[PDB]
A paper describes a structure:
Shiga toxins belong to the AB5 family of protein toxins and are comprised of an enzymatically active A subunit and a non-toxic pentameric B subunit. Interaction between the B subunit and the carbohydrate moiety of the glycosphingolipid Gb3 on the extracellular leaflet of cell plasma membranes enables these toxins to enter host cells through receptor-mediated endocytosis and to be retrogradely transported from the Golgi apparatus to the endoplasmic reticulum (ER). The pathology of STEC infection is primarily caused by the action of two exotoxins—Shiga toxin 1 (Stx1) and Shiga toxin 2 (Stx2)—which attack the ribosomes and trigger apoptosis upon their uptake by the host cells. Five predominant Stx1 subtypes and ten Stx2 subtypes have been reported, with Stx2a, Stx1a, and Stx2c mainly associated with HUS.
We report the engineering of a panel of designed ankyrin repeat proteins (DARPin) with potent neutralization activity against Stx2a, the major subtype associated with HUS. To circumvent the high cost associated with antibody therapeutics, we engineered alternative toxin-neutralizers templated on the designed ankyrin repeat protein (DARPin). DARPin is a small (18 kDa) scaffold protein which has been engineered to bind diverse targets, and it enjoys a low immunogenicity potential, a very high expression yield in microorganisms (15 g per liter of E. coli culture in fermenters, or 23% of dried cell weight), high solubility, and long shelf life. Employing a protein engineering approach combining both directed evolution and rational design, we created a dimeric DARPin SD5 with potent neutralization activity against Stx2a (EC50 0.6 nM). SD5 is composed of two DARPins—SHT, which targets the toxin A subunit and neutralizes the toxin catalytic activity, and #3, which binds the B subunit and induces a novel conformational change in the B subunit that distorts the five-fold symmetry and interferes with toxin attachment. The two monomeric DARPin constituents of SD5 exhibit complementary functions—SHT targets the enzymatic A subunit of Stx2a and inhibits the toxin’s catalytic activity, while DARPin #3 binds the B subunit, based on the cryo-EM study, and induces a novel conformational change in the B subunit that distorts its five-fold symmetry and presumably interferes with toxin attachment to target cells. Finally, the unprecedented toxin conformational change induced by DARPin #3 represents a novel mode of action for neutralizing Stx2 toxicity and reveals new targets for future drug development. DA1-SD5, composed of SD5 fused to an albumin-binding DARPin, efficiently protects mice against Stx2a intoxication when premixed with the toxin.
Numbering used by the authors:
A (entry chain A): 1 to 242, 259 to 297
B (entry chain B), D (entry chain F), E (entry chain C), F (entry chain E), G (entry chain D): 1 to 70
C (entry chain G): 1 to 185
Write the structure that this text describes.
């Protein structure tokens, strides 16, 4: 499947993300209001991907329209990008299982991880700015990119694009914060530590939310949701956990009417007597 | 003997550094410090604990306890 | 053995009497050495303690720790069961492996009535634990003002120093029990 | 006495190795190291704690605390 | 030898301060104090552990255990 | 003085037996072992910590820290 | 040197009381007692840890480790 993510306006952008979500995921029965929900990605074979045509970087203009992201559908990772003018798919090294028919595939030495991209980009996501202008710059960098090894600017472009596409698809919080940059005032979106943390906890969040049954709160590691609007305002799409499991097999523990990721509670309840701990050096 | 089996109703760190837990309506205390986090963790996670001891009268000491997620 | 110690812990006097009458041993230890008298004593079941003792259950019997039924009674605040154990010959000044008397345990858990009954039965007021902790140190620690005032009244040594030189006044300050510190001034 | 009952509003490790918790608007500190992680777990999980001390003035010490779940 | 690999079915603090876990239907005890909370947290989350010991019969002791991500 | 306030960005135990945490873009360390589990638990649960010291210079030691759930 | 940076694939309490983690396919042990619960908490929560040591071959010891939130 191919979808467009149109950055022309906040409306076009959110519409685009919502359309993608509806096609690739199904709302959780217990975390759904109207047509805004936390949805679980529908099962698809590994290797299944959907293409995202980037549009609207120059509001409503058919300009800067040769970039397509290839997104692995089951986990929403950006497997690579396609320059549709040259018909070339630059694929990350960890996505050799993704095959795009009809294009020249350039298998890269660079893997898709943020650890790598941030390194090559010499750009940390925490504090990373994204604006319409830097997405255009990002687009130009990707279109100028050629090679089997990502460059700094191409990595910066991918960090920005993954954030506003795949991460926004996962997190309504990021969709909300980033979309402000698309307004006529063209402010700058600055990725926050909290935004980064969400992205880093997506699998954990994914394993927990399906168990939610209206508890007074949800705690997953550093992430806390105090009510359903916090959940909905933050998370839009989660992995189908039916990277969901880190260790163990118990998704959650309800403690004082708060649904905790069990691993989180286990991680602060595994301390022995403090006096013995500190003195036993 | 199995003094009590159930969820911990409350726990309490005492001034003499022992630790009390109320299980199935009876209070027991233990002077074993490492049982403090073990018992508090059981209480927080809703584990069923089985307090075991030579004697089992409420307000009695114990140093054997089984923990079950259920 | 397990059934007679479960019955004892549950205070189920007719089940204790039926098991005893079917030849269950009155002295039957669990793992860790806990006997039916230990369980009855910790739960404060007076009736169970009297029927066990009048079937010939050993009053001084010791856990693996060296805790006796009079220690378990004392830990649990069970005044009447402390009094009947003492009146059946339980040693007031029995010390566990770590030197803890019943007066130490009572003090530790704030139980003023059994501190008073133990003192009146000849408990050693100033008895030293292995780290040199007296009842006054355990009661200043844990913040039991009433215990600390019943001790002192009975001639407890306020000057007494633990294995680190630390007085009762020290250990109240280190527990932030400012009313205990005032009472110890 | 029951000095304060409620959720831990904040906890704080002090330079003298004591540990302070604020419960129901009052602050109490304890020099019992064992209580540090137990209070933090209680704070993290929203346990209702009851600070018990012979002196309940905010700012005073305690070494007895009960932990209850909802 | 790797005696048992699986989730902890129950854990038990023992009177002699050792700590027992039941894994793959067999009970094993350890005197390693540090393993108590680690085993209990593994237990609470369903973490697979591998009990390693010289003897694997239920009732054996262990001083080595691997916490797996299975 | 409140030196830094924020979630813990990373923590690190150093060969020289100091435990560093990075809070609000600044690194501070403590050699109080009591604080290691407290700080790491704060880190993994996303508590807001307030590093307090008379010494607020970057890379300095601290032994006072407030923990808040947020 | 940064020997390995990644999630803990397994942890193991060793017979000599040291504690091993497998990170990036290599095993590293530490005798630092403070690190045991911390490393297990990192494993439980999938924290990326960075093992730093003067030798990086599997089987090397370490006494320095960073706990990150990725
Ligand atoms: Na749409
Ligand atoms: Na759908
Ligand atoms: Na889990
Ligand atoms: Na008992
Ligand atoms: Na006080």
């Amino acid at each position: 499947r191919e979808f467009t993510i149109d950055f022309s306006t906040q409306q076009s952008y959110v519409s685009s993300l919502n359309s993608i979500r509806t096609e690739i995921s199904t709302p959780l029965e217990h975390i759904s209001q109207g047509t805004t929900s936390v949805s679980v990605i529908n099962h698809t074979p590994p290797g299944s991907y959907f293409a995202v045509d980037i549009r609207g970087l120059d509001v409503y203009q058919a300009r800067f329209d040769h970039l397509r992201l290839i997104i692995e559908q089951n986990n929403l990772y950006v497997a690579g990008f396609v320059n549709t003018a040259t018909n070339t798919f630059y694929r990350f090294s960890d996505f050799t299982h993704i095959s795009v028919p009809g294009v020249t595939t350039v298998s890269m030495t660079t893997d898709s991880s943020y650890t790598t991209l941030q390194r090559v980009a010499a750009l940390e996501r925490s504090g990373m700015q994204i604006s319409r202008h830097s997405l255009v710059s990002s687009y130009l960098a990707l279109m100028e990119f050629s090679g089997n090894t990502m460059t700094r600017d191409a990595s910066r472009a991918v960090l920005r694009f993954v954030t506003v596409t795949a991460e926004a698809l996962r997190f309504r919080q990021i969709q909300r914060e980033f979309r402000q940059a698309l307004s006529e005032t063209a402010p700058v979106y600055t990725m926050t530590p909290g935004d980064v943390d969400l992205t880093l906890n997506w699998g954990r969040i994914s394993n927990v939310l399906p168990e939610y049954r209206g508890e007074d709160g949800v705690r997953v590691g550093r992430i806390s949701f105090n009510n359903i609007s916090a959940i909905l305002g933050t998370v839009a799409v989660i992995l189908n956990c039916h990277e969901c499991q880190i260790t163990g097999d118990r998704p959650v523990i309800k403690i004082n009417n708060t649904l905790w990721e069990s691993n989180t509670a286990a991680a602060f309840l595994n301390r022995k007597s403090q006096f013995l701990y500190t003195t036993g050096k | 003997a199995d003094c009590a089996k159930g969820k911990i109703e409350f726990s309490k760190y005492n001034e003499d550094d022992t630790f009390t837990v109320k299980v199935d309506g009876k209070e027991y205390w233990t002077s074993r410090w490492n049982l403090q986090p073990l018992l508090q963790s059981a209480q927080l996670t809703g584990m069923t604990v089985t307090i075991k001891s030579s004697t089992c009268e409420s307000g009695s000491g114990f140093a054997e306890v089984q923990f079950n997620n259920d | 053995g397990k059934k007679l110690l479960e019955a004892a812990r549950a205070g189920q006097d007719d089940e204790v009497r039926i098991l005893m009458a079917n030849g269950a041993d009155v002295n039957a230890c669990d793992s860790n050495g806990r006997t039916p008298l230990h369980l009855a004593a910790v739960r404060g079941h007076l009736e169970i303690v009297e029927v066990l003792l009048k079937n010939g259950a050993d009053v001084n019997a010791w856990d693996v720790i060296g805790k006796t039924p009079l220690h378990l009674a004392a830990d649990g605040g069970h005044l009447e069961i402390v009094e009947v154990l003492l009146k059946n010959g339980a040693d007031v000044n029995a010390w566990d492996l770590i030197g803890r008397t019943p007066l130490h345990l009572a003090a530790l858990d704030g139980h003023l009535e059994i501190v008073e009954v133990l003192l009146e039965h000849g408990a050693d007021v100033n008895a030293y634990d292995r780290p040199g902790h007296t009842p006054l140190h355990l009661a200043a620690r844990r913040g039991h003002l009433e215990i600390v005032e019943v001790l002192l009244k009975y001639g407890a040594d306020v000057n007494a120093q633990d294995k680190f030189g630390k007085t009762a006044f020290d250990i109240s300050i280190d527990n932030g029990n400012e009313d205990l510190a005032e009472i110890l001034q």
